[PDB]
Short mmCIF file of C-alpha atoms and ligand atoms in Angstrom, two decimals:
data_model
loop_
_atom_site.label_atom_id
_atom_site.label_comp_id
_atom_site.label_asym_id
_atom_site.label_seq_id
_atom_site.Cartn_x
_atom_site.Cartn_y
_atom_site.Cartn_z
CA UNK A 1 -11.12 -9.95 -12.36
CA UNK A 2 -12.07 -6.65 -13.93
CA UNK A 3 -9.71 -3.66 -14.44
CA UNK A 4 -12.18 -1.17 -15.99
CA UNK A 5 -15.30 -0.01 -14.09
CA UNK A 6 -17.55 -0.45 -17.19
CA UNK A 7 -16.03 -3.98 -17.62
CA UNK A 8 -16.87 -4.64 -13.96
CA UNK A 9 -20.52 -3.86 -14.26
CA UNK A 10 -21.01 -6.74 -16.68
CA UNK A 11 -19.60 -8.99 -13.88
CA UNK A 12 -21.57 -10.70 -11.14
CA UNK A 13 -20.03 -10.76 -7.63
CA UNK A 14 -21.12 -13.94 -5.83
CA UNK A 15 -19.09 -13.14 -2.75
CA UNK A 16 -19.26 -9.25 -2.66
CA UNK A 17 -22.95 -9.24 -3.09
CA UNK A 18 -23.14 -10.92 0.33
CA UNK A 19 -20.95 -8.29 2.03
CA UNK A 20 -21.94 -4.92 3.52
CA UNK A 21 -20.57 -2.88 0.66
CA UNK A 22 -22.48 -0.67 -1.81
CA UNK A 23 -23.27 -2.20 -5.14
CA UNK A 24 -21.15 -1.15 -8.11
CA UNK A 25 -24.25 0.28 -9.85
CA UNK A 26 -25.82 2.23 -7.08
CA UNK A 27 -25.02 5.87 -6.42
CA UNK A 28 -24.24 6.80 -2.78
CA UNK A 29 -25.83 9.91 -1.30
CA UNK A 30 -25.52 8.99 2.34
CA UNK A 31 -22.77 8.93 5.02
CA UNK A 32 -22.78 5.98 7.40
CA UNK A 33 -22.48 2.17 8.08
CA UNK A 34 -23.97 -0.20 5.55
CA UNK A 35 -25.25 -2.29 8.47
CA UNK A 36 -25.44 -1.84 12.23
CA UNK A 37 -22.65 -3.27 14.44
CA UNK A 38 -23.18 -6.85 15.52
CA UNK A 39 -23.54 -7.50 19.20
CA UNK A 40 -22.92 -11.22 19.01
CA UNK A 41 -19.93 -12.55 17.00
CA UNK A 42 -19.39 -16.09 15.72
CA UNK A 43 -16.98 -17.69 18.13
CA UNK A 44 -15.59 -20.44 15.76
CA UNK A 45 -13.18 -20.03 12.91
CA UNK A 46 -14.78 -20.55 9.45
CA UNK A 47 -14.11 -23.91 7.93
CA UNK A 48 -11.35 -24.35 5.39
CA UNK A 49 -11.26 -27.02 2.69
CA UNK A 50 -10.16 -30.49 3.98
CA UNK A 51 -6.40 -30.66 4.62
CA UNK A 52 -5.85 -27.06 5.54
CA UNK A 53 -5.73 -25.31 8.97
CA UNK A 54 -5.62 -21.79 10.40
CA UNK A 55 -2.36 -20.69 12.04
CA UNK A 56 -1.72 -17.28 13.49
CA UNK A 57 1.75 -16.34 12.56
CA UNK A 58 4.21 -15.10 15.11
CA UNK A 59 6.27 -12.71 13.01
CA UNK A 60 8.66 -12.37 15.95
CA UNK A 61 9.80 -15.88 15.16
CA UNK A 62 12.49 -15.48 12.51
CA UNK A 63 11.58 -18.79 10.77
CA UNK A 64 7.84 -17.93 10.62
CA UNK A 65 8.57 -14.53 9.27
CA UNK A 66 10.73 -16.07 6.63
CA UNK A 67 7.90 -18.44 5.61
CA UNK A 68 5.70 -15.45 5.06
CA UNK A 69 8.42 -13.72 3.13
CA UNK A 70 8.66 -16.76 0.88
CA UNK A 71 4.85 -17.11 0.35
CA UNK A 72 4.63 -13.53 -0.68
CA UNK A 73 7.91 -13.56 -2.65
CA UNK A 74 6.52 -16.50 -4.75
CA UNK A 75 2.78 -15.74 -4.85
CA UNK A 76 1.97 -12.13 -4.22
CA UNK A 77 1.06 -9.32 -6.57
CA UNK A 78 2.37 -9.41 -10.19
CA UNK A 79 2.04 -6.86 -13.02
CA UNK A 80 -0.47 -7.55 -15.83
CA UNK A 81 2.25 -9.28 -18.07
CA UNK A 82 3.51 -11.49 -15.28
CA UNK A 83 7.02 -10.07 -15.56
CA UNK A 84 7.41 -8.45 -12.14
CA UNK A 85 6.34 -9.56 -8.63
CA UNK A 86 6.59 -7.57 -5.38
CA UNK A 87 9.42 -8.66 -3.14
CA UNK A 88 8.60 -7.35 0.38
CA UNK A 89 11.57 -7.89 2.68
CA UNK A 90 11.26 -9.65 6.05
CA UNK A 91 12.17 -6.44 7.82
CA UNK A 92 9.68 -4.41 5.84
CA UNK A 93 6.93 -6.95 6.62
CA UNK A 94 7.72 -6.45 10.31
CA UNK A 95 7.29 -2.62 9.83
CA UNK A 96 4.08 -2.98 7.89
CA UNK A 97 2.56 -5.72 10.18
CA UNK A 98 3.60 -4.71 13.75
CA UNK A 99 2.69 -1.00 13.98
CA UNK A 100 1.28 0.28 17.27
CA UNK A 101 -1.79 -1.72 18.27
CA UNK A 102 -1.00 -4.85 16.15
CA UNK A 103 -2.58 -8.06 17.31
CA UNK A 104 -1.35 -11.56 16.78
CA UNK A 105 -4.72 -13.04 15.76
CA UNK A 106 -4.79 -10.49 12.97
CA UNK A 107 -1.74 -12.24 11.17
CA UNK A 108 -3.95 -14.89 9.70
CA UNK A 109 -2.17 -17.74 7.96
CA UNK A 110 -3.36 -20.95 6.32
CA UNK A 111 -1.16 -24.02 6.41
CA UNK A 112 -1.34 -27.47 4.76
CA UNK A 113 -2.05 -29.94 7.65
CA UNK A 114 0.44 -32.59 6.57
CA UNK A 115 3.43 -30.65 5.29
CA UNK A 116 2.77 -27.50 7.42
CA UNK A 117 3.51 -25.47 4.21
CA UNK A 118 2.28 -21.91 4.47
CA UNK A 119 -0.24 -21.37 1.53
CA UNK A 120 -2.47 -18.48 2.50
CA UNK A 121 -2.44 -15.23 4.48
CA UNK A 122 -4.33 -12.14 5.26
CA UNK A 123 -3.63 -9.40 7.76
CA UNK A 124 -5.38 -6.55 9.62
CA UNK A 125 -3.69 -3.62 11.43
CA UNK A 126 -5.69 -1.05 13.45
CA UNK A 127 -5.91 2.46 12.17
CA UNK A 128 -7.98 5.54 12.98
CA UNK A 129 -9.51 6.84 9.76
CA UNK A 130 -10.92 10.18 8.94
CA UNK A 131 -13.60 9.86 6.24
CA UNK A 132 -15.26 13.12 5.29
CA UNK A 133 -16.74 14.46 8.46
CA UNK A 134 -16.23 11.18 10.46
CA UNK A 135 -13.33 9.83 12.53
CA UNK A 136 -13.59 5.98 12.90
CA UNK A 137 -11.51 3.23 14.41
CA UNK A 138 -11.03 0.77 11.53
CA UNK A 139 -8.57 -1.85 10.30
CA UNK A 140 -6.43 -1.87 7.20
CA UNK A 141 -6.48 -5.11 5.34
CA UNK A 142 -3.38 -6.03 3.44
CA UNK A 143 -1.29 -8.94 2.16
CA UNK A 144 -4.22 -11.11 1.09
CA UNK A 145 -2.35 -13.96 -0.63
CA UNK A 146 -3.37 -17.44 -1.79
CA UNK A 147 -0.63 -19.83 -3.10
CA UNK A 148 -0.85 -20.16 -6.90
CA UNK A 149 -1.61 -23.90 -6.49
CA UNK A 150 -4.69 -23.11 -4.37
CA UNK A 151 -6.17 -20.37 -6.56
CA UNK A 152 -9.75 -20.35 -7.98
CA UNK A 153 -10.92 -22.67 -5.12
CA UNK A 154 -12.98 -20.16 -3.03
CA UNK A 155 -10.20 -19.82 -0.51
CA UNK A 156 -9.94 -15.95 -0.62
CA UNK A 157 -13.62 -15.50 0.53
CA UNK A 158 -12.80 -17.67 3.55
CA UNK A 159 -9.79 -15.60 4.35
CA UNK A 160 -11.80 -12.41 4.13
CA UNK A 161 -14.65 -13.74 6.30
CA UNK A 162 -12.24 -15.14 8.92
CA UNK A 163 -10.35 -11.78 9.27
CA UNK A 164 -13.64 -10.11 9.34
CA UNK A 165 -14.74 -12.23 12.25
CA UNK A 166 -11.50 -11.75 14.16
CA UNK A 167 -11.79 -7.96 13.71
CA UNK A 168 -15.44 -8.04 14.76
CA UNK A 169 -14.38 -9.83 18.01
CA UNK A 170 -12.23 -6.76 18.93
CA UNK A 171 -15.18 -4.29 18.43
CA UNK A 172 -14.29 -2.88 15.06
CA UNK A 173 -16.83 -2.86 12.20
CA UNK A 174 -15.28 -0.88 9.30
CA UNK A 175 -12.20 -1.48 7.24
CA UNK A 176 -10.12 0.25 4.49
CA UNK A 177 -8.29 -1.59 1.73
CA UNK A 178 -6.91 -1.13 -1.76
CA UNK A 179 -6.99 -3.35 -4.77
CA UNK A 180 -5.75 -3.28 -8.41
CA UNK A 181 -9.06 -4.90 -9.42
CA UNK A 182 -12.52 -3.21 -9.48
CA UNK A 183 -14.85 -4.45 -6.74
CA UNK A 184 -18.00 -3.16 -5.07
CA UNK A 185 -17.47 -0.32 -4.59
CA UNK A 186 -14.50 2.15 -4.95
CA UNK A 187 -14.52 5.28 -2.76
CA UNK A 188 -11.59 6.54 -4.88
CA UNK A 189 -9.55 5.50 -7.89
CA UNK A 190 -5.87 6.34 -8.04
CA UNK A 191 -3.29 5.82 -10.71
CA UNK A 192 0.47 4.87 -10.34
CA UNK A 193 2.99 7.04 -12.15
CA UNK A 194 6.64 6.15 -12.52
CA UNK A 195 9.82 8.29 -12.65
CA UNK A 196 12.80 6.52 -14.21
CA UNK A 197 16.01 6.72 -12.20
CA UNK A 198 18.11 4.09 -14.05
CA UNK A 199 16.50 4.24 -17.47
CA UNK A 200 18.94 1.77 -18.99
CA UNK A 201 18.04 -1.00 -16.58
CA UNK A 202 14.36 -0.15 -16.80
CA UNK A 203 14.44 -0.62 -20.64
CA UNK A 204 16.66 -3.70 -20.63
CA UNK A 205 14.15 -5.55 -18.32
CA UNK A 206 11.15 -4.09 -20.28
CA UNK A 207 9.79 -2.27 -17.31
CA UNK A 208 9.64 0.78 -19.68
CA UNK A 209 10.19 1.19 -23.28
CA UNK A 210 11.97 3.87 -25.35
CA UNK A 211 9.75 6.72 -26.32
CA UNK A 212 8.77 6.59 -30.00
CA UNK A 213 10.82 9.46 -31.24
CA UNK A 214 13.90 9.48 -28.98
CA UNK A 215 17.01 7.45 -28.49
CA UNK A 216 18.68 5.82 -25.60
CA UNK A 217 21.34 8.60 -25.33
CA UNK A 218 18.47 11.08 -25.26
CA UNK A 219 16.44 9.02 -22.68
CA UNK A 220 19.51 9.00 -20.39
CA UNK A 221 20.06 12.65 -20.70
CA UNK A 222 16.39 13.41 -20.17
CA UNK A 223 16.21 11.55 -16.80
CA UNK A 224 19.69 12.69 -15.48
CA UNK A 225 19.34 14.23 -12.03
CA UNK A 226 21.70 16.34 -9.86
CA UNK A 227 24.16 14.50 -7.68
CA UNK A 228 22.86 16.19 -4.46
CA UNK A 229 19.51 17.79 -3.28
CA UNK A 230 19.07 21.47 -3.45
CA UNK A 231 16.72 22.38 -0.69
CA UNK A 232 18.55 24.19 2.15
CA UNK A 233 18.65 22.36 5.47
CA UNK A 234 17.36 19.04 4.14
CA UNK A 235 18.43 16.18 6.41
CA UNK A 236 17.25 12.75 7.69
CA UNK A 237 14.54 12.76 10.31
CA UNK A 238 15.76 12.33 13.92
CA UNK A 239 14.04 11.32 17.19
CA UNK A 240 13.82 15.02 18.07
CA UNK A 241 11.71 15.54 14.87
CA UNK A 242 8.95 13.17 15.85
CA UNK A 243 6.69 15.78 17.49
CA UNK A 244 6.97 18.37 14.69
CA UNK A 245 6.56 15.72 11.97
CA UNK A 246 3.35 14.63 13.64
CA UNK A 247 2.20 18.24 13.89
CA UNK A 248 3.01 18.91 10.30
CA UNK A 249 1.32 15.77 9.06
CA UNK A 250 -1.74 16.19 11.13
CA UNK A 251 -2.45 19.87 9.87
CA UNK A 252 -1.54 18.93 6.31
CA UNK A 253 -3.92 15.99 6.13
CA UNK A 254 -7.07 18.06 7.11
CA UNK A 255 -7.49 19.23 3.46
CA UNK A 256 -8.22 15.66 2.09
CA UNK A 257 -11.28 13.48 2.61
CA UNK A 258 -9.79 10.06 3.30
CA UNK A 259 -6.80 10.18 5.67
CA UNK A 260 -5.18 8.35 8.67
CA UNK A 261 -5.31 10.01 12.08
CA UNK A 262 -1.87 9.02 13.61
CA UNK A 263 -0.86 9.33 17.16
CA UNK A 264 2.71 10.51 17.85
CA UNK A 265 3.62 6.88 18.39
CA UNK A 266 2.36 5.95 15.02
CA UNK A 267 4.16 8.82 13.48
CA UNK A 268 7.29 7.55 14.97
CA UNK A 269 6.58 4.06 13.60
CA UNK A 270 5.69 5.06 10.12
CA UNK A 271 8.37 7.73 9.50
CA UNK A 272 11.40 7.19 11.65
CA UNK A 273 14.03 6.15 9.18
CA UNK A 274 15.07 2.44 8.80
CA UNK A 275 17.53 1.63 6.13
CA UNK A 276 15.93 -0.16 3.12
CA UNK A 277 12.49 0.27 4.54
CA UNK A 278 11.44 3.89 5.09
CA UNK A 279 13.20 7.15 4.37
CA UNK A 280 12.09 10.45 5.85
CA UNK A 281 13.96 13.79 5.27
CA UNK A 282 12.91 16.96 7.04
CA UNK A 283 13.74 20.61 6.16
CA UNK A 284 15.26 22.40 9.16
CA UNK A 285 15.49 26.11 8.19
CA UNK A 286 17.87 28.88 9.16
CA UNK A 287 15.97 29.33 12.44
CA UNK A 288 16.19 25.66 13.37
CA UNK A 289 12.54 25.03 12.64
CA UNK A 290 11.36 21.97 10.73
CA UNK A 291 8.88 23.28 8.04
CA UNK A 292 8.58 20.35 5.54
CA UNK A 293 9.31 16.72 5.12
CA UNK A 294 9.45 14.11 2.34
CA UNK A 295 9.22 10.33 2.68
CA UNK A 296 9.30 7.26 0.60
CA UNK A 297 9.38 3.48 1.40
CA UNK A 298 11.39 0.67 -0.16
CA UNK A 299 9.69 -2.01 -2.12
CA UNK A 300 11.74 -4.04 -4.69
CA UNK A 301 10.29 -6.44 -7.16
CA UNK A 302 11.46 -9.75 -8.50
CA UNK A 303 12.14 -9.72 -12.29
CA UNK A 304 10.71 -13.09 -13.26
CA UNK A 305 12.50 -15.56 -15.63
CA UNK A 306 15.37 -13.07 -16.42
CA UNK A 307 18.86 -14.62 -16.65
CA UNK A 308 20.86 -11.48 -15.66
CA UNK A 309 18.59 -8.88 -13.92
CA UNK A 310 16.91 -10.53 -10.95
CA UNK A 311 15.41 -7.51 -9.04
CA UNK A 312 14.12 -4.04 -9.57
CA UNK A 313 14.62 -1.57 -6.68
CA UNK A 314 11.69 0.78 -6.35
CA UNK A 315 10.94 3.72 -4.07
CA UNK A 316 7.32 4.55 -3.27
CA UNK A 317 6.15 8.05 -2.43
CA UNK A 318 4.71 8.06 1.07
CA UNK A 319 3.63 11.26 2.74
CA UNK A 320 5.08 14.57 1.59
CA UNK A 321 4.19 17.72 3.65
CA UNK A 322 5.21 21.26 2.53
CA UNK A 323 4.66 24.48 4.37
CA UNK A 324 7.61 26.65 3.30
CA UNK A 325 9.39 24.63 0.55
CA UNK A 326 7.55 24.31 -2.70
CA UNK A 327 6.20 20.71 -3.23
CA UNK A 328 7.91 20.55 -6.63
CA UNK A 329 11.32 21.32 -5.05
CA UNK A 330 10.66 18.81 -2.23
CA UNK A 331 9.81 15.95 -4.70
CA UNK A 332 12.84 16.81 -6.89
CA UNK A 333 15.05 16.26 -3.91
CA UNK A 334 13.18 13.03 -3.24
CA UNK A 335 14.16 11.90 -6.75
CA UNK A 336 17.70 12.90 -6.18
CA UNK A 337 17.81 11.14 -2.86
CA UNK A 338 16.28 7.97 -4.36
CA UNK A 339 18.80 8.05 -7.12
CA UNK A 340 21.62 8.38 -4.63
CA UNK A 341 20.28 5.45 -2.61
CA UNK A 342 20.45 3.16 -5.62
CA UNK A 343 16.72 3.01 -6.62
CA UNK A 344 15.94 2.20 -10.28
CA UNK A 345 12.50 3.87 -10.29
CA UNK A 346 10.49 6.21 -8.19
CA UNK A 347 6.73 5.49 -8.04
CA UNK A 348 3.93 7.80 -6.94
CA UNK A 349 0.18 7.88 -7.04
CA UNK A 350 -1.93 10.72 -8.30
CA UNK A 351 -3.55 11.33 -4.90
CA UNK A 352 -3.16 14.30 -2.64
CA UNK A 353 -1.49 17.19 -4.58
CA UNK A 354 0.75 14.75 -6.54
CA UNK A 355 -0.74 15.77 -9.98
CA UNK A 356 0.89 19.25 -9.45
CA UNK A 357 4.33 17.70 -9.95
CA UNK A 358 4.01 14.27 -11.67
CA UNK A 359 4.34 15.60 -15.34
CA UNK A 360 6.69 18.50 -14.43
CA UNK A 361 9.13 16.01 -12.82
CA UNK A 362 9.01 13.64 -15.76
CA UNK A 363 6.81 10.87 -14.31
CA UNK A 364 5.21 8.61 -16.87
CA UNK A 365 1.61 7.39 -16.31
CA UNK A 366 1.31 3.79 -15.34
CA UNK A 367 -0.97 1.09 -16.65
CA UNK A 368 -2.43 0.08 -13.24
CA UNK A 369 -5.16 1.71 -11.15
CA UNK A 370 -5.18 1.45 -7.43
CA UNK A 371 -8.84 1.35 -6.14
CA UNK A 372 -9.58 2.45 -2.58
CA UNK A 373 -12.38 0.72 -0.73
CA UNK A 374 -14.18 1.01 2.62
CA UNK A 375 -16.00 -1.96 4.21
CA UNK A 376 -19.35 -1.37 5.87
CA UNK A 377 -19.28 2.36 5.18
CA UNK A 378 -21.41 4.28 2.75
CA UNK A 379 -20.20 7.66 1.42
CA UNK A 380 -19.76 9.43 -1.86
CA UNK A 381 -16.68 8.67 -3.97
CA UNK A 382 -13.97 11.27 -4.25
CA UNK A 383 -11.43 12.24 -6.82
CA UNK A 384 -7.89 11.00 -6.49
CA UNK A 385 -6.68 14.49 -5.36
CA UNK A 386 -8.89 14.10 -2.23
CA UNK A 387 -7.44 10.75 -1.24
CA UNK A 388 -4.82 11.31 1.49
CA UNK A 389 -4.01 7.79 2.60
CA UNK A 390 -1.02 5.71 1.46
CA UNK A 391 -0.86 2.04 2.31
CA UNK A 392 2.14 -0.27 2.14
CA UNK B 1 0.11 -0.88 -4.07
CA UNK B 2 -2.22 -3.88 -4.57
CA UNK B 3 -1.37 -3.34 -8.28
CA UNK B 4 1.99 -3.54 -10.04
CA UNK B 5 1.92 -0.72 -12.56
CA UNK B 6 4.29 0.02 -15.48
CA UNK B 7 4.47 3.10 -17.71
CA UNK B 8 1.66 2.92 -20.26
C1 LIG C 401 -6.02 -12.22 -4.64
C2 LIG C 401 -6.13 -13.70 -4.36
C3 LIG C 401 -6.03 -13.99 -2.94
C4 LIG C 401 -7.51 -14.22 -4.83
O1 LIG C 401 -7.49 -15.64 -4.60
P1 LIG C 401 -8.22 -16.54 -5.73
O2 LIG C 401 -7.93 -17.95 -5.63
O3 LIG C 401 -7.69 -16.09 -7.16
O4 LIG C 401 -9.89 -16.10 -5.71
P2 LIG C 401 -10.97 -17.18 -5.07
O5 LIG C 401 -11.21 -18.28 -6.04
O6 LIG C 401 -10.35 -17.74 -3.75
O7 LIG C 401 -12.35 -16.25 -4.86
C5 LIG C 401 -12.38 -15.03 -5.52
C6 LIG C 401 -13.36 -14.12 -4.84
O8 LIG C 401 -12.72 -13.26 -4.02
C7 LIG C 401 -12.66 -11.78 -4.83
N1 LIG C 401 -11.30 -11.23 -4.86
C8 LIG C 401 -10.32 -11.67 -5.73
N2 LIG C 401 -9.25 -10.90 -5.48
C9 LIG C 401 -9.55 -10.14 -4.37
C10 LIG C 401 -8.82 -9.23 -3.65
N3 LIG C 401 -7.41 -8.65 -3.79
N4 LIG C 401 -9.37 -8.50 -2.65
C11 LIG C 401 -10.66 -8.70 -2.31
N5 LIG C 401 -11.41 -9.66 -3.03
C12 LIG C 401 -10.80 -10.34 -4.05
C13 LIG C 401 -13.12 -12.06 -6.13
O9 LIG C 401 -13.72 -10.76 -6.56
C14 LIG C 401 -14.13 -13.12 -5.89
O10 LIG C 401 -15.27 -12.63 -5.37
P3 LIG C 401 -16.59 -12.37 -6.32
O11 LIG C 401 -17.18 -13.69 -6.67
O12 LIG C 401 -17.56 -11.47 -5.69
O13 LIG C 401 -16.05 -11.71 -7.64
C15 LIG C 401 -5.11 -14.44 -5.23
O14 LIG C 401 -5.41 -14.30 -6.60
C16 LIG C 401 -3.71 -13.84 -5.01
O15 LIG C 401 -3.02 -14.21 -4.01
N6 LIG C 401 -3.17 -12.84 -5.87
C17 LIG C 401 -1.78 -12.33 -5.72
C18 LIG C 401 -1.77 -11.26 -4.50
C19 LIG C 401 -2.97 -10.38 -4.58
O16 LIG C 401 -3.61 -10.05 -3.48
N7 LIG C 401 -3.45 -9.74 -5.78
C20 LIG C 401 -4.69 -8.90 -5.80
C21 LIG C 401 -4.44 -7.42 -6.35
S1 LIG C 401 -5.98 -6.67 -6.74
C1 LIG C 402 -5.43 -6.64 -0.37
O1 LIG C 402 -4.59 -7.47 0.03
C2 LIG C 402 -6.54 -6.13 0.41
C3 LIG C 402 -7.63 -7.29 0.37
C4 LIG C 402 -8.98 -6.77 0.91
C5 LIG C 402 -9.84 -7.96 0.99
C6 LIG C 402 -11.30 -7.47 1.52
C7 LIG C 402 -11.31 -7.12 2.98
C8 LIG C 402 -12.59 -6.68 3.36
C9 LIG C 402 -12.62 -6.12 4.83
C10 LIG C 402 -12.43 -7.25 5.77
C11 LIG C 402 -12.33 -6.76 7.21
C12 LIG C 402 -13.65 -6.15 7.75
C13 LIG C 402 -13.54 -5.86 9.23
C14 LIG C 402 -14.81 -5.20 9.81
#
């Protein structure tokens, strides 16, 4: 897999060349589908290698959910140095995979026939997507995972074609997805940044390193945060805030070029606070009006092969909407709140207006890009500051 | 993400 775009144009894409996505080399000056919708869809599941079978996973079954948790806990995304691996919790997986409109056939697992061991997965969830001047019903593809023992055996293309087929059956012909690798063809390239909250732990586990000309004592003083937030009237989101949070989000997102279009029910799902999954804080001013909100989701990572430190607790910036409170103040309170809740690090991408605060609030640039992709949709690429979509 | 980043 290629990490740089120039390194990717020396690569040949035996699978992606067959798919309705623009070629890495071509420049896109149009807006529309790569190919027309299909009006007959293959009725049969694609064939897996001998000894493996499809199984749609009922994540409402606690045992099955735990099998998926374990597949991902052991085989999902790692950093470049193979030191850290995402550790999505079972309850977080339910949040990410059963939003409004979720469909059981879109939780697409692969099992070993004999042992029944879960060795593969891919998911779709439905989402209405605004892309430049077009609003489309699409799916979001996530959690593509092949067991380490099954890798480099052409299994991932089968998972992709099978989820494509199952989405086609429901009348949907576009998708959005993100990858750390460069593929044909990014609509936008974002960059993770990191804000230390427990610098000591981060250094001991080699998530970060001491800056060249400063000491540990200095690093700790540099990243120290207030004990409590400063914004007047900041509080956790409640049921009564669902409408205004939907209103605020909907109006705020119009300024970007790739955004979700959430119903009020989707807003309830994605923002209503759930401990250790999603945090949302609103600003209720002196008149009782909600004028801003901040939000971040919980995603720890396994620290691989470490005898003492086993896990790294990370907060991920979600959607932050400002209309009366400065964004910089909002995000400082996010950092303070994440520190209070025990997070070790606060991550955020350089999309939306995030570049206006990343350096000022002492974020450090990461080593990983997050590429954004559309399936079967041709449009011009956009800068990170025009991406207004955050995926789990 | 679909990418585990660390400070460069
Ligand atoms: C991603 C993963 C499923 C790929 O499985 P694999 O066994 O390594 O790849 P396969 O041999 O089955 O086939 C690779 C094909 O699928 C493509 N591919 C690889 N990873 C992909 C991804 N996340 N998304 C979409 N396509 C991907 C490859 O580009 C290749 O297609 P190409 O010939 O056009 O280049 C597997 O490595 C994995 O589970 N990684 C950890 C979780 C994860 O999703 N990491 C990806 C972050 S970018
Ligand atoms: C990370 O897990 C995302 C992996 C994306 C794999 C490619 C998906 C391509 C779109 C498939 C669905 C198309 C529905 C019309």
